[PDB]
Amino acid sequence: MENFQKVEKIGEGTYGVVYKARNKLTGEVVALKKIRVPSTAIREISLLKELNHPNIVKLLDVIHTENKLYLVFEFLHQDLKKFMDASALTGIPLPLIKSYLFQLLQGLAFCHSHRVLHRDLKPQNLLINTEGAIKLADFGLARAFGVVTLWYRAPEILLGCKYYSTAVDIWSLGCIFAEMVTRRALFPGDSEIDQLFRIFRTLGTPDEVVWPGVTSMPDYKPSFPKWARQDFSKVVPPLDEDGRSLLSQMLHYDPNKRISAKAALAHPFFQDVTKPVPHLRL
Numbered sequence: 001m002e003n004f005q006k007v008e009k010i011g012e013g014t015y016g017v018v019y020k021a022r023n024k025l026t027g028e029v030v031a032l033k034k035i036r037v038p039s040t041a042i043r044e045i046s047l048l049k050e051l052n053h054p055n056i057v058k059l060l061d062v063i064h065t066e067n068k069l070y071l072v073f074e075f076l077h078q079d080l081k082k083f084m085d086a087s088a089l090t091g092i093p094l095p096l097i098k099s100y101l102f103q104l105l106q107g108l109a110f111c112h113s114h115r116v117l118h119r120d121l122k123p124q125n126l127l128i129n130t131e132g133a134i135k136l137a138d139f140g141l142a143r144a145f146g147v148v149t150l151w152y153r154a155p156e157i158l159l160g161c162k163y164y165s166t167a168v169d170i171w172s173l174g175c176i177f178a179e180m181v182t183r184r185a186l187f188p189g190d191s192e193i194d195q196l197f198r199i200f201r202t203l204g205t206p207d208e209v210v211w212p213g214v215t216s217m218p219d220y221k222p223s224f225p226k227w228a229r230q231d232f233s234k235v236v237p238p239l240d241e242d243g244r245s246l247l248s249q250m251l252h253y254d255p256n257k258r259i260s261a262k263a264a265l266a267h268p269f270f271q272d273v274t275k276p277v278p279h280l281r282l
C-alpha cells in the first residue's frame, strides 16, 4: 500500500518478494512481504498474528486491500545464511552454534505445541540481530498458501507421505545444525531422487527394521540401491559426543522416533549453553 516506501528489495521468498519498508505514519522499519485471495488463507494468516514468541519473527499486520495481500513483519538485519558465509573461513564458535540451536528449538517447541509447522526451514529463513538472538521467519505460511532448495527436506516428504508432522522441522533443524558445525551442507541434492540418495548414502537405505511402514510409502521403490550407514564421527567432525548424539536423534528416519523440540531442549548438549554476542558487520 502507499503507506510504505519500499526502501530496498531484501529478497525473493517463496510466496513473493520481501522489501525493507518504512511505515509513513509510525516511521518504523519493517519487512514487507508482497504475496501475488482465498478465504481460508486469510483466516489462517490471521491466526499467525497471535503467535507471539521471542524466537519467532513477529507478523505485525496483514494488508488485504484491492484484492492484494501484503504481510508486514518485524525487521531483522541479517539471515543465518549470510552470517555463515561471513564465517566460512573461521567457522562459527561452538558456544554461538549451541546458543542459536537452543533458541531455535524453543521457537519450534512453541509452534509445535500450537500444532503449527514451518515445513520449510532453511538458513535463509533464520534471522539474527546484534544482540545474540535468532528468529524463525515464514512460520506457518506453507500451510496457509501451500530453484527451490530440497537440501533440508525430510525423507517422509520426499517419499510421498502427504500427512507429515512436526518431525519434519526437526529434520530440517538437524541438517542446519550439521551445516553450522562443518561449514558444508549435509545433503545438497539437486533433484528429489538425488536428495533421497544422498540421504541414503550417509544414513543407509531405510528398511522395515529401522522404519516400519517405509516400504508402503507412495514413492518408495523396491529397486532403491541399498547403501550401508556411515559412521557419524565421519559425517560431522569435530562435534563432541553429546552433539553427535543429539544430531543422530534429530536425523532418525522414522518420524515417530525422531526427537521432539521439547525433549531436545533437555539434552546434555545444552548443559553448558550460554548466550554470546556475535560480531555482526551490517
Ligand SMILES: NS(=O)(=O)c1ccc(N/N=C2\C(=O)Nc3ccc(Br)cc32)cc1
Pocket: 010, 011, 013, 018, 030, 031, 033, 057, 073, 074, 075, 076, 077, 078, 079, 082, 083, 127, 137, 138
Ligand atoms: N542476506 S541478508 O542481507 O543478511 C538479509 C537481511 C535481512 C533479511 N530479513 N528479512 C526479513 C525480516 O526482517 N523479517 C522478515 C519476515 C518474513 C520473511 Br519471509 C523475511 C523477513 C533477509 C536477508
